[PDB]
Ligand binder design. Structure first.
Ligand SMILES: COc1cc2c(cc1OC)[C@H]1Cc3ccc(NC(=O)NCc4ccc(OC(F)(F)F)cc4)cc3CN1CC2
Ligand SMILES: [Mg+2]
Length: 548
């Protein structure tokens, strides 16, 4: 009775415009008899060429000659002559290419799966061996990840509306007819489903079909707020391991193809902090490499403090590129990662295609002042003095991992921390709740991932990034006569009460062609506070500065 599974057609529902609709306009353009392309498309019926193509018996390249004869045969009966420029190859090439994803439909499908539905795609498709088959391959891959099953006609040897495929569909979904809703742009494909007892929605226009699907499922799909970008499931990611040197191996996650983009997280985060950026960046045509920085998660965490100074952390990232075969890579960082990528561009510009930083500005070294004096001359950086002593800051953060991350990963309007009274009060969480409320930015599952990551190597490694003030300062002073002249981007967050946008006001002195981005109502955790704006800024900057 109560629905539980949802099935979606591709051509006409999830993808628009349908191939039949582009074939109809072609009939109008070249002034053919109406429907002639569709009579040739459907010549022979269940024993014709198109059904042999839809069943995997022949490939698309094999079917085009058969479609050419059907058009010459159909044009002979209607007493007409096909133009001199008639090309079925070129006609379908434009149709397959013009087909885009119906985002209101896919977003509604995601909402159902989020609410606990089993989503699937049931489409009549073909084995595409065209030279331009990659265009259709990209489309399928980005739709496949959002559904539990993709049942293709040419893979199973069954086509709609043959009843055998619907019995195969119900077996795949492991559900009864009256528990499944099925959407298709063709009414013929619904009669066998409507006979087995499943709910049917004829999709003519998307917003009306969504109104019907709202009613039968009891879930609001239309006029739903803007959904978050696609997140990452760790157990479905490609996990990579590179040994940059003895006792030091770096763990990273990889997705997509194209120019290598290397993401560097901050303190106290993980590769998972790019969960909203990784698919979005890979979809834009990039090979994302989200790192576990030295001392974090599955990466090595040697205890020595000097192993985390900026000079060592940068030489190892260069090595990481070497052992992977990458001459360059776009470096996007946040918090400590952002500071590391600034010095990557300053010391190894030949290995940085482009550099970008979230929140963290490039503050050049002061040759006449130690960094400890400057940190003391700023009450917001007072927690960094508390971090200096080893073991002290570790005991507090490692005491209750759940409370630690729930008190940190909070929006700008949820803050329960006072970064300016840390050393005085003798702790970061002295005046914070023992069981803080779950922020709007992170679910309980996402918090429990960070907990499991930091159960590995603790907080010693991460905190050691703070404990190389004098070493990093001596190193940076060697680059005081340089200038960053590669593509650079500085993204500032309005409500970051520690890395304020005003700290970046002088950066153009050192980066003349610096580009900028600003995100409003955004706290420190830029990636998970405003992921849709982070994705927009980066994909726009990458497409114009990093790619060729
Ligand atoms: C050469 O002059 C400097 C040089 C340098 C530094 C300062 C300098 O003076 C100009 C400081 C600056 C700095 C600032 C922030 C961070 N980020 C960070 O610690 N993030 C963790 C975190 C953030 C917010 C939190 O609170 C809440 F969660 F939002 F609530 C809790 C934790 C890093 C650095 C790097 N430093 C050394 C270099
Ligand atoms: Mg269709």
């Amino acid at each position: 009775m109560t629905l539980r599974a949802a099935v979606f057609d591709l051509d006409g529902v999830l993808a628009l415009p349908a191939v039949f609709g582009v074939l109809g306009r072609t009939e109008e353009a070249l002034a053919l008899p109406r429907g002639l392309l569709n009579d040739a498309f459907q010549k022979g019926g269940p024993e014709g060429a198109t059904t042999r193509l839809m069943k995997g018996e022949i490939t698309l390249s094999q079917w085009i000659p058969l479609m050419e004869e059907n058009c010459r045969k159909c044009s002979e009966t209607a007493k007409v002559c096909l133009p001199k420029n008639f090309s079925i190859k070129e006609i379908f090439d434009k149709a397959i290419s013009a087909r885009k994803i119906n985002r209101p439909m896919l977003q509604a499908a995601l909402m159902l799966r989020k609410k606990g539905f089993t989503t699937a795609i049931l489409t009549n498709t073909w084995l595409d061996d065209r030279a331009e088959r990659d265009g259709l391959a990209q489309l399928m891959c980005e739709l496949k990840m959002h559904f539990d099953f993709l049942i293709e006609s040419c893979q199973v040897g069954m086509v709609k509306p043959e009843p055998q495929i619907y019995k195969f569909l119900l077996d795949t979904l492991k559900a009864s007819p009256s528990e499944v809703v099925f959407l298709d742009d063709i009414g013929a494909n619904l009669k066998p489903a409507r006979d087995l007892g499943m709910v049917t929605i004829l999709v003519q226009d998307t917003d009306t079909a969504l109104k019907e699907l709202e009613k039968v499922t009891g879930i609001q799909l239309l006029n739903t707020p803007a959904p978050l970008p696609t997140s990452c499931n760790p157990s479905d990611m490609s996990h990579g391991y590179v040994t940059v040197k003895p006792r030091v191996r770096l763990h990273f996650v990889e997705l997509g193809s194209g120019p290598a983009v290397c993401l560097c997280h901050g303190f106290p985060e993980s590769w998972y902090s790019w969960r909203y950026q990784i698919p979005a960046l890979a979809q834009a045509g990039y090979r994302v490499l989200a790192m576990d920085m030295k001392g974090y998660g599955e990466s090595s965490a040697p205890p020595e403090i000097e192993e985390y100074c900026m000079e060592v952390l940068c030489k190892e990232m260069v090595t990481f590129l070497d052992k992977l075969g990458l001459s360059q890579a776009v470096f996007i960082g946040h918090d400590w990662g952002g500071m590391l990528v600034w010095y990557m561009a300053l010391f190894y510009p030949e290995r940085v295609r482009a550099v970008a930083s979230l929140n963290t500005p490039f503050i050049p070294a002061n040759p006449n002042m130690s960094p400890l004096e400057s940190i003391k001359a700023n009450p917001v950086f007072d927690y960094q003095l508390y971090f200096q002593e080893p073991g002290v800051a570790e005991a507090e953060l490692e005491q209750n991992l759940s409370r630690t991350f729930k008190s940190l990963f909070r929006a700008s309007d949820e803050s329960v921390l006072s970064m300016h009274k840390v050393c005085e009060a003798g702790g970061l969480f002295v005046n914070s709740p023992e069981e803080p409320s779950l922020s709007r930015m992170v679910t309980e599952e996402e918090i429990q991932f960070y907990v499991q990551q930091f159960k590995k190597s603790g907080f010693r490694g991460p905190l050691n990034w703070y404990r190389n003030m004098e070493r990093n300062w001596k190193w940076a002073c060697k680059s005081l006569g340089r200038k960053i002249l590669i593509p650079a981007l500085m993204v500032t967050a309005e409500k970051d009460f520690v890395l304020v946008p005003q700290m970046s006001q002088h950066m153009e002195d050192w980066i003349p062609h610096l580009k900028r981005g600003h995100i409003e109502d955004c706290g420190h955790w830029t990636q998970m506070d405003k992921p849709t704006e982070v994705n927009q800024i980066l994909i726009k900057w990458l497409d114009s500065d990093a790619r060729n």
